[PDB]
Design a protein around this ligand. Structure first.
Ligand SMILES: [Cl-]
Ligand code: NA
Length: 146
């Protein structure tokens, strides 16, 4: 819906507003936490998905990454922030809708991905970030069909 689109835009920009007061060190940590969370959610979804469904989505990520290459650093920074805020919206929902147990394993699953991400080189680290941004833009584009 258009009225449904407008509500999600407000939420994204509202979430971004809480980011303005946080510090570059806090913001770096939030960015890294968001990435790790998208990664566990990615991994979990690849289990429950087909060999063909995994090819189709992998190419969806790549086509999205190609659109990003077409954009200016200003737009790319904007896009990066929208995705991060949109993920933070879900993390808010997630934080309310599950109890201390489900919260627990997720934190651990987050912690592993952060560990896995720290062990990577800088080129690969940058590559994972961008794929995570592209993937969220993918599912964001699917949801933005309703
Ligand atoms: Cl970026
Ligand atoms: Na690496």
């Amino acid at each position: 819906s258009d009225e449904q689109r407008r509500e999600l835009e407000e939420k994204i920009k509202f979430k971004l507003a809480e980011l303005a007061s946080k510090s570059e060190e806090e913001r770096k940590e939030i960015k890294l936490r968001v990435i790790a969370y998208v990664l566990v959610q990615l991994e979990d979804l690849q289990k429950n998905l087909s060999d063909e469904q995994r090819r189709e989505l992998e190419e969806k990520i790549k086509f999205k990454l190609a659109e990003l290459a077409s954009k200016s650093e200003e737009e790319r920074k904007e896009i990066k922030l929208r995705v991060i805020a949109y993920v933070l919206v879900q993390l808010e929902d997630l934080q309310k809708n599950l109890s201390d147990e489900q919260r627990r394993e997720l934190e651990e699953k987050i912690k592993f991905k952060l560990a896995e991400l720290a062990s990577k080189s800088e080129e690969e680290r940058k590559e994972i970030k961008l794929r995570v941004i592209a993937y969220v833009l993918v599912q964001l584009e699917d949801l933005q069909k309703n």
